[PDB]
From a paper:
The 2H phosphoesterase superfamily is an ancient group of proteins and protein domains characterized by a common fold and a few conserved active site residues. E. coli LigT is a 20-kDa protein that exhibits 2′,3′-cyclic nucleotide 3′-phosphodiesterase and 2′-5′-ligase/phosphodiesterase activities, but the biological function of the enzyme is unknown. The LigT structure presents a typical 2H phosphoesterase fold, in which the catalytic residues reside at the beginning of strands β2 and β6. As in other 2H family members, the active site has 2-fold symmetry; this symmetry also includes the 4 water molecules at the bottom of the active site, connecting the active-site β strands through water-mediated hydrogen bonds.
We also cocrystallized the enzyme with ATP and 3′-AMP, which are neither substrates nor products. The fact that they bind the active site can imply that they may be weak inhibitors, and it can be taken as evidence of a general propensity to bind nucleotides in the active site. Two similar datasets were collected with ATP, one of which has one ATP bound to only one of the 2 monomers in the asymmetric unit. This ATP molecule probably has a partial occupancy and/or some degree of flexibility, as evidenced by residual difference electron density. The other complex has three ATP molecules for two monomers; the space group remains the same. In addition to the ligand in both active sites, another ATP in the latter crystal form is bound in the vicinity of it in one monomer; this ATP is also involved in crystal contacts. The binding of this second ATP is a strong indication of a propensity for binding further nucleotides in the active site vicinity by E. coli LigT. Residues interacting with the second ATP include Phe159 and Arg6. Again, the α-5′-phosphate of the active-site ATP is in the same location as the corresponding phosphate in NADP+, and it is similarly coordinated by Arg6, highlighting putative RNA recognition features extending from the active site.
Author numbering: 2 to 110, 120 to 176
Write the structure that this text describes.
Amino acid sequence: SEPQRLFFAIDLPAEIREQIIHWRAKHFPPEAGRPVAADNLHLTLAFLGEVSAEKEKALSLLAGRIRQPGFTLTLDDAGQWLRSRVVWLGMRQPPRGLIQLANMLRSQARPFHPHITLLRDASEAVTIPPPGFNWSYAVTEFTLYASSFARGRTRYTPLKRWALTQ
Protein backbone atom coordinates (compact mmCIF):
# COMPACT_ATOMS: atom_id res chain seq x y z
CA SER A 1 0.00 0.00 0.00
CA GLU A 2 0.87 3.73 -0.27
CA PRO A 3 4.17 4.96 1.23
CA GLN A 4 3.75 7.35 4.16
CA ARG A 5 6.12 9.84 5.79
CA LEU A 6 6.73 8.34 9.23
CA PHE A 7 8.43 8.98 12.58
CA PHE A 8 8.49 7.73 16.18
CA ALA A 9 8.04 10.35 18.93
CA ILE A 10 7.42 11.18 22.59
CA ASP A 11 4.48 13.55 23.17
CA LEU A 12 3.94 16.31 25.71
CA PRO A 13 1.02 16.56 28.17
CA ALA A 14 -1.49 19.27 27.26
CA GLU A 15 -0.82 21.53 30.23
CA ILE A 16 2.89 21.64 29.41
CA ARG A 17 2.28 22.29 25.70
CA GLU A 18 0.21 25.33 26.73
CA GLN A 19 2.88 26.55 29.17
CA ILE A 20 5.45 26.23 26.36
CA ILE A 21 3.53 28.31 23.82
CA HIS A 22 2.75 31.07 26.40
CA TRP A 23 6.47 31.20 27.24
CA ARG A 24 7.39 31.18 23.51
CA ALA A 25 5.07 34.12 22.75
CA LYS A 26 6.56 36.00 25.71
CA HIS A 27 10.20 35.70 24.65
CA PHE A 28 10.13 35.39 20.87
CA PRO A 29 8.68 37.93 18.44
CA PRO A 30 6.99 36.50 15.32
CA GLU A 31 10.10 37.69 13.44
CA ALA A 32 12.34 35.25 15.35
CA GLY A 33 11.10 32.35 13.22
CA ARG A 34 8.12 30.19 12.29
CA PRO A 35 6.35 28.86 15.41
CA VAL A 36 5.39 25.19 15.76
CA ALA A 37 1.68 24.75 16.52
CA ALA A 38 0.98 23.57 20.08
CA ASP A 39 -0.45 20.21 18.96
CA ASN A 40 2.65 19.61 16.82
CA LEU A 41 5.19 19.97 19.61
CA HIS A 42 6.97 16.64 20.16
CA LEU A 43 10.31 14.97 20.74
CA THR A 44 11.35 12.82 17.78
CA LEU A 45 13.00 9.48 18.61
CA ALA A 46 13.76 8.37 15.04
CA PHE A 47 12.88 9.86 11.68
CA LEU A 48 12.08 7.01 9.29
CA GLY A 49 11.33 8.69 5.95
CA GLU A 50 8.92 7.59 3.23
CA VAL A 51 7.90 4.07 4.22
CA SER A 52 6.12 1.33 2.28
CA ALA A 53 3.14 -0.27 4.01
CA GLU A 54 5.37 -3.34 4.00
CA LYS A 55 8.24 -1.90 6.00
CA GLU A 56 5.78 0.09 8.12
CA LYS A 57 4.59 -3.29 9.41
CA ALA A 58 8.09 -4.58 10.12
CA LEU A 59 8.96 -1.44 12.03
CA SER A 60 5.64 -1.56 13.89
CA LEU A 61 6.17 -5.19 14.89
CA LEU A 62 9.71 -4.53 16.10
CA ALA A 63 8.69 -1.42 18.09
CA GLY A 64 6.28 -3.92 19.66
CA ARG A 65 9.25 -5.99 20.84
CA ILE A 66 10.77 -3.14 22.85
CA ARG A 67 10.71 -3.71 26.61
CA GLN A 68 11.58 -0.47 28.33
CA PRO A 69 10.54 1.07 31.65
CA GLY A 70 9.08 4.58 31.65
CA PHE A 71 11.18 7.63 32.52
CA THR A 72 10.73 11.26 33.56
CA LEU A 73 11.63 14.20 31.29
CA THR A 74 12.43 17.60 32.79
CA LEU A 75 12.89 20.31 30.19
CA ASP A 76 15.62 22.46 31.75
CA ASP A 77 17.35 23.51 28.52
CA ALA A 78 16.84 25.67 25.43
CA GLY A 79 19.06 26.73 22.57
CA GLN A 80 19.36 27.43 18.87
CA TRP A 81 20.94 25.54 15.96
CA LEU A 82 21.73 28.06 13.19
CA ARG A 83 22.59 25.45 10.54
CA SER A 84 19.24 23.70 11.09
CA ARG A 85 17.55 27.07 11.68
CA VAL A 86 15.72 25.84 14.80
CA VAL A 87 15.04 27.03 18.29
CA TRP A 88 14.56 24.04 20.58
CA LEU A 89 13.75 22.87 24.09
CA GLY A 90 15.75 20.05 25.70
CA MET A 91 17.05 18.21 28.78
CA ARG A 92 20.69 18.74 29.86
CA GLN A 93 21.13 15.17 31.09
CA PRO A 94 18.43 13.12 29.43
CA PRO A 95 17.60 9.83 31.18
CA ARG A 96 19.30 6.63 29.98
CA GLY A 97 15.94 5.19 29.01
CA LEU A 98 15.28 7.92 26.43
CA ILE A 99 18.60 7.33 24.70
CA GLN A 100 18.15 3.54 24.78
CA LEU A 101 14.65 3.90 23.31
CA ALA A 102 15.81 6.21 20.53
CA ASN A 103 18.80 4.01 19.73
CA MET A 104 16.73 0.79 19.56
CA LEU A 105 14.32 2.51 17.14
CA ARG A 106 17.19 3.89 15.06
CA SER A 107 18.71 0.38 14.86
CA GLN A 108 15.60 -1.70 14.11
CA ALA A 109 15.30 0.28 10.88
CA ARG A 110 24.74 12.32 13.13
CA PRO A 111 24.19 11.17 16.75
CA PHE A 112 20.90 11.47 18.68
CA HIS A 113 20.28 14.93 20.11
CA PRO A 114 16.87 14.75 21.77
CA HIS A 115 15.07 18.07 21.46
CA ILE A 116 11.65 19.59 20.97
CA THR A 117 11.60 22.17 18.19
CA LEU A 118 9.76 25.44 18.99
CA LEU A 119 10.53 27.65 15.97
CA ARG A 120 11.40 26.75 12.38
CA ASP A 121 13.30 28.94 9.88
CA ALA A 122 15.12 30.73 12.70
CA SER A 123 17.99 31.87 10.46
CA GLU A 124 18.98 34.77 12.70
CA ALA A 125 20.70 34.23 16.02
CA VAL A 126 18.45 35.28 18.92
CA THR A 127 18.71 35.46 22.69
CA ILE A 128 17.74 32.19 24.34
CA PRO A 129 16.22 32.54 27.81
CA PRO A 130 15.93 29.45 30.02
CA PRO A 131 12.67 27.40 29.82
CA GLY A 132 9.82 28.19 32.20
CA PHE A 133 9.66 26.50 35.60
CA ASN A 134 8.85 22.85 36.39
CA TRP A 135 8.20 21.48 32.89
CA SER A 136 8.63 17.92 34.18
CA TYR A 137 6.57 14.83 33.42
CA ALA A 138 6.39 11.04 33.17
CA VAL A 139 6.77 9.44 29.72
CA THR A 140 4.38 6.45 29.62
CA GLU A 141 4.36 5.57 25.94
CA PHE A 142 5.72 6.37 22.48
CA THR A 143 3.91 6.80 19.16
CA LEU A 144 4.32 6.12 15.44
CA TYR A 145 3.19 9.16 13.46
CA ALA A 146 2.50 9.98 9.81
CA SER A 147 3.14 13.55 8.69
CA SER A 148 1.02 15.10 5.96
CA PHE A 149 0.58 18.65 4.67
CA ALA A 150 -3.06 19.77 4.78
CA ARG A 151 -4.51 23.27 4.18
CA GLY A 152 -0.96 24.64 4.22
CA ARG A 153 -0.37 23.41 7.77
CA THR A 154 1.63 20.38 8.88
CA ARG A 155 -0.45 17.55 10.32
CA TYR A 156 0.70 14.57 12.39
CA THR A 157 -1.51 11.47 12.37
CA PRO A 158 -0.98 8.90 15.15
CA LEU A 159 -0.82 5.37 13.73
CA LYS A 160 0.12 3.24 16.74
CA ARG A 161 1.30 3.69 20.34
CA TRP A 162 3.27 1.45 22.71
CA ALA A 163 3.19 1.77 26.48
CA LEU A 164 6.52 1.94 28.25
CA THR A 165 6.51 -0.22 31.39
CA GLN A 166 6.69 1.06 34.96
